[PDB]
Amino acid sequence: HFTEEDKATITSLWGKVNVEDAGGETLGRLLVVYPWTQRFFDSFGNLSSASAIMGNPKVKAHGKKMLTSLGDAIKHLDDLKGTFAQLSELHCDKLHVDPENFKLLGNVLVTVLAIHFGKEFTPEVQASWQKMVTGVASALSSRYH
Amino acid sequence: HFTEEDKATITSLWGKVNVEDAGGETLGRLLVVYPWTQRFFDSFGNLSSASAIMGNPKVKAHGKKMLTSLGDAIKHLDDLKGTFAQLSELHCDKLHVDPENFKLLGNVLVTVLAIHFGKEFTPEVQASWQKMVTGVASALSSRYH
Amino acid sequence: VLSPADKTNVKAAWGKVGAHAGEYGAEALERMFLSFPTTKTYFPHFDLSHGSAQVKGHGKKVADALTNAVAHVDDMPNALSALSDLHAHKLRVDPVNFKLLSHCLLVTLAAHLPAEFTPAVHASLDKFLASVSTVLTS
Amino acid sequence: VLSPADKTNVKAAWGKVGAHAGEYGAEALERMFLSFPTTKTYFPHFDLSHGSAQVKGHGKKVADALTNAVAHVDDMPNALSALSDLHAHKLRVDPVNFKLLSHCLLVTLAAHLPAEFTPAVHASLDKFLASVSTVLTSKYR
Ligand code: HEM
Ligand code: HEM
Ligand code: HEM
Ligand code: HEM
């Protein structure tokens, strides 16, 4: 249920987003704010504090990879489930990530968009992005069911 | 994505359930165990205690109606989303029931099934019903997206 | 438990809010009402429309309690001990919806203080809002 | 965070568990592993099949901790302190998982003690398990 305005708002803001910077910032903040999530990223090296996590090149690279696959979905908002079908099998079967973590990461992303857009990130614009976040988390949980 | 085995287990166990009694027990326990849900049923009268709640004639009637629509959905486990479409609009658009509450209710139903079936409700049998809970909650939360 | 840098960050961040704490409290509520309509059912006797004076007034109360809590990070369960009985026992608020308001407050702060909303401060603010939440639930 | 009726319900219900505390803890784990497979990753080198001696051994430790918590319902932060550090800092258990284990324990109790598991006792056991969970995640917080 992406409304016409939802689609329009989400497409506009994503155009203005620097994916590499939002991605690294997003994954990094997930790791700092929600420490248990570091269990899935043991091989990335030192994740002991805000300073270590945010300057970590592997965290930067990987968040950029996260965020770009999200950008794929924005081109095709009506079939989020399809787009994320293989990443679902990945995060579920291989990585064993609990689905609640998908909502946590999406909420961190919303706060990173807020930082970037400031007063442009109105309560209405945020409501559209919360829908996107919910939709994405849903699509990633799909191979859990 | 239920497995066939899950569908068998859900269908077989549901056939031995008295929908009336499990329905009232389920809604009663939800209201007692999670008192914030009582806010959605302002019209129901005396919910001041476990005793009053479990004995409240409106609570029983309502629990019956709720679990009856679950039984009707059990006939088409491949299409829960389509079945609960109208109910999803009702709970979300009209009542503004938090989707997390949908899981709570399913979890309470699971315990009520455990009370009724005893050791027939094996860990394996429970796993199938948890999928059912997840599937119902998701079909009902659909109109949040 | 909150580290010394956590208390320092929370107090720093709340100082950067300046005279807009009431305003930011109201915006967080309004954000929560748009993104999560289920929270509106806790406010049956409120006008919740955009620009509402009741929302504006309630935001100042929330911001005041938060300001009060920041002042007493060391013995928070006590400073909010009064509020704890009202939300948990009387209003009966889902311990889950405290996360929604916490998210919306952080989004509001991010949107208004981008320079101040560093990762460290974000983690400190999140632990702070979680501790507040647990106090209002436990 | 409990009440006199609560404390009484918990103690009565937990005392009906009796000689089977360990067994119920192992069954609760097994229910969690099967219903919520992601929780298996916390036990990489355990035998997680049914009747596993490692799970039996472990269900016994959980139940002991619960038994101790019941014996100190009023000072739970003190009683479960080392477990708190263990689950948060060392094992880094996702908070979500505590809710899942709690549900599985309630199911086990429901399945074994149908008559004891009244709505009021069910409410008490839930608040008790929520409290235990809160303490176990306090290092996050
Ligand atoms: C919006 C939510 C998410 C999106 C779009 C997403 C997307 C991705 C993508 C595109 C990859 C690359 C995989 C490949 O190229 O083969 C990946 C890998 C990975 N994801 Fe995510 N993910 C999400 C949520 C999460 C969360 C919340 C966690 C952990 C709590 C997580 C854990 C991982 C890990 C550990 C890897 C790589 C494992 C390795 O280094 O080999 N994901 N994800
Ligand atoms: C498995 C999940 C659920 C199912 C299958 C279900 C089913 C139903 C059904 C069939 C109705 C009847 C409406 C009508 O007759 O027109 C109803 C109404 C209602 N439901 Fe649910 N429900 C579920 C979960 C919940 C939950 C968790 C709540 C939490 C508060 C809730 C709150 C309500 C309320 C307040 C009504 C009002 C009906 C009246 O006042 O007559 N429902 N539901
Ligand atoms: C950091 C979190 C929160 C803080 C600091 C907070 C603070 C407050 C304050 C200061 C009041 C006014 C008390 C008075 O002066 O009478 C209040 C009342 C109230 N709050 Fe909250 N609150 C928080 C979270 C929430 C959440 C998440 C909800 C619902 C989703 C909520 C719902 C309510 C309701 C329904 C009232 C009573 C409204 C009335 O009768 O006028 N609160 N809270
Ligand atoms: C819900 C209440 C829980 C209680 C009372 C509890 C209690 C315990 C106890 C007593 C131990 C043994 C600690 C020792 O060595 O002294 C332990 C270890 C452990 N627990 Fe828990 N626990 C709980 C929840 C969980 C959950 C939800 C998970 C994960 C889903 C979990 C995963 C583990 C792991 C991986 C170990 C170490 C096992 C090993 O490798 O030896 N626990 N817990």
Complete domains list, chain D, with CATH = 1-141 (1.10.490.10)
Residue D61 at interface with chain A, using a CB cutoff of 8 Å: no
Q: How far is CA D12 from the centre of its chain?
A: 16
Q: How far is D94 from chain A (nearest CA, A)?
A: 6
The helix (H) or strand (E) run that includes residue B115 is helix B99-117
Backbone angles phi and psi of A64, in degrees to 5: -65, -40
Give the residue from B109, B126, B14, B95 showing the smallest Cα distance to B66. B109
CA distance A43 to A21: 22
| CA D59–ligand 4 middle distance (angstroms) | 9
Q: Which of residues 74-133 of D touch C (CB under 8 A)?
A: 131
**C58 assigned ligand-binding residue:** yes
CA distance C76 to C69: 6
| CA D134–ligand 4 middle distance (angstroms) | 14
CATH number at A1-145: 1.10.490.10
Burial (CB < 10 A; 0-12, 13-18, 19+), residue D102, is buried
| Probe target for ligand 1 pocket from A37, A42, A88, A95, with the most ligand atoms within 8 Å of CB | A95
Residue A124 at interface with chain D, using a CB cutoff of 8 Å: no
| Probe target for ligand 4 pocket from D31, D55, D60, D87, with the most ligand atoms within 8 Å of CB | D87
Task: Show the tokens assigned to B94.
Answer: 């009209």
Kindly list the distances between the CA atom of residue D59 and the CA atoms of A45, A78, B66, D120, in Å, as whole numbers in the listed order: 34, 46, 36, 26
Task: Show the tokens assigned to A52.
Answer: 């270590």
C96 vs B40, B42, B100: nearest CB: B100
CB of D101 within 6 A of ligand 4: the answer is: yes
| CA A66–ligand 1 middle distance (angstroms) | 6
Q: How far is C111 from chain A (nearest CA, A)?
A: 4
CA distance A33 to A49: 10
Chain breaks in chain D (C to N over 2.5 A) after: none
Instruction: Name which residue sits closest to atom 26 of ligand 3, judged by CA.
Output: C98
The helix (H) or strand (E) run that includes residue C110 is helix C98-112
| CA B141–ligand 2 middle distance (angstroms) | 13
- Contact (CB, 8 A) for C132 and D141: no
CB spacing of D120 vs B32 below 8 angstroms:
yes
Task: Show the tokens assigned to C94.
Answer: 């889902």
Give the residue from D48, D140, D38 showing the smallest Cα distance to D97. D38
Give the residue from B47, B42, B43, B37 showing the smallest Cα distance to B99. B37
Give the residue from C51, C72, C80, C67 showing the smallest Cα distance to C17. C67
Give the residue from C58, C76, C56 showing the smallest Cα distance to C10. C76
Method: X-ray
- Contact (CB, 8 A) for C21 and C67: yes
Q: Which of D36, D93, D94, D98 to mutate to test the interface with A (most CBs of A within 10 A)?
A: D94
Q: What is the DSSP letter of C2?
A: -
CB of D91 within 6 A of ligand 4: the answer is: yes
Amino acid at A78: D
**D20 assigned ligand-binding residue:** no
Amino acid at A90: L
CA distance B10 to B131: 10
Chain pair B-C, CB pairs under 8 angstroms: 27
